[PDB]
Amino acid sequence: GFFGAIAGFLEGGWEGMIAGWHGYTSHGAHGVAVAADLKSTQEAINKITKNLNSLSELEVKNLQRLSGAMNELHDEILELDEKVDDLRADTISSQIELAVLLSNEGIINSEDEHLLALERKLKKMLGPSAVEIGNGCFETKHKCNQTCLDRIAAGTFNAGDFSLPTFDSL
């Protein structure tokens, strides 16, 4: 979004990322490895699913006929009744449009926020020996190929598997 543009996040995207919307890339001698983070993808999906349920919860009064106003006899009143219905339809429509607009605004905006959170998952796993650049990238002392990258995505990656120091967990 606007954050990633200013922060110098990569503006392009990775076609290799299929299992999910968000994840990690690894750049080294092997070339470029790509892995999706399912947790980050799932969270985004749950937010959207909740947002879909929320929009679907809206109820409005039925518009039916007036019980008393009779055709021919009360045509003037009926014209006003038609007008009342039309304006109700118009007003609720624009309100729903606003609710959906704000929903889509949130979903698209939350992308960089996901990336920022994926930094924190990546950072902790990599241990204190890795170097944070700031553009969403870390420089590692160890090599990290597709097999390595995949363990990161799964959250099972250990830095001791390259004799590197770790943040010992709780």
Partner: protein, 341 residues
């Protein structure tokens, strides 16, 4: 090695509007609308739906029933939802009415607006004490009853002066009492018969135009009869007749009396409609076929999937999608990104 955070790149044919980024392509959406297709109307799921007023009255129109045409009496079940299937209801029998001279056609459409509809079990006026000399009650072959004897609309009494009473009268006044129960509206049906110069004199002893005036809840209506030269018989029994009746209805709110000022040819109110509650009403057609979540004036019966719908907005009742101007979509993916350099 350098490890980065990245976002996927895929085909992004779908478009959504945002507040701060305008329209953007995305990898996936959840559609929030559909355009429904026109279908037959149906019963509203979880609610008995009224079509014909009296379902067991075969070969009877709603107006037939509302007027109390002989052979067309029966149970009128309550309903919280009603379909208006005749914008201008018609009769299909009994004595020839000149419908367009009053508001009478809309009477069954008025009734169906109520949840509960019943015909009164006693008469609202005793014809044997009604003003305007002694009467005998007239009938017609146009209105054969359940044993095919000559009858008349059960809501009215075609009162005729006795042979010693064939004489003109000044306009006399009768008060129509409120005979319904707590909370019920009373709908009083009444009118007047007229004929050519000869029959008028035979029946009433007067061939001059007669005058009628009703008054209820601030509403007054005035009529003057026509002597012969009537328009052709229509929507009646098909049996040729030289006379015509004019029919009207009178709404009496709870505890309210009405008055009718009449001369010769008066059709005095007998049985009256007692109605209460409200039925939700929309335009539609018969028969009702199956069930549906939503009855929609334009699409008929439709079941609810998406929360919203696009197309022709109109009156609709039940569990319905909400109308919107445009096919809205909820984003289910990421804003499009080009493949990495």
């Amino acid at each position: 090695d350098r490890i980065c955070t990245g976002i996927t790149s895929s085909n992004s044919p779908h478009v959504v509007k945002t507040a701060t980024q305008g329209e953007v392509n995305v990898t996936g959406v959840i559609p929030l609308t559909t355009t429904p297709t026109r279908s037959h109307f149906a019963n509203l799921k979880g609610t008995q739906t009224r079509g014909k007023l009296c379902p067991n009255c075969f070969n009877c129109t709603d107006l037939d029933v509302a007027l109390g045409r002989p052979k067309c009496m029966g149970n009128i079940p309550s309903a919280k939802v009603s379909i208006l299937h005749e914008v201008k209801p018609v009769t299909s029998g009994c004595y020839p009415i000149m419908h367009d001279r009053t508001k009478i056609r809309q009477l069954p459409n008025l009734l169906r607006g109520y949840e509960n509809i019943r015909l009164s079990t006693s008469n609202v006026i005793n014809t044997e004490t009604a003003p305007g000399g002694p009467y005998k009650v007239g009938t017609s072959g146009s209105c054969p009853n359940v044993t095919n004897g000559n009858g008349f609309f059960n809501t009215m009494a075609w009162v005729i002066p006795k042979d010693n009473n064939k004489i003109a009268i000044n306009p006399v006044t009768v008060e129509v009492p409120y005979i319904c129960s707590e909370g019920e509206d009373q709908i009083t049906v009444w009118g007047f018969h007229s004929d050519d110069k000869t029959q008028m004199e035979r029946l009433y002893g007067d061939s001059n135009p007669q005058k009628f005036t009703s008054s209820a809840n601030g509403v007054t209506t005035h009529y003057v009869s026509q002597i012969g030269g009537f328009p052709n018989q229509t929507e009646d029994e098909g049996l040729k007749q030289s006379g015509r009746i004019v029919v009207d209805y009178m709404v009496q709110k709870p505890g309210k009396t009405g008055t009718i000022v009449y001369q010769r040819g008066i059709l005095l109110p007998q049985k009256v409609w007692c109605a209460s509650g409200r039925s939700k009403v929309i335009k539609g057609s018969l028969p009702l076929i199956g069930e549906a979540d939503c009855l929609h004036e334009k699409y008929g019966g439709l079941n609810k999937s998406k929360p919203y719908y696009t197309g022709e907005h109109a009156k609709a009742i039940g569990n319905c999608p909400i109308w919107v101007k445009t096919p809205l979509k909820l984003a289910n993916g990421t804003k499009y990104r080009p493949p990495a350099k």
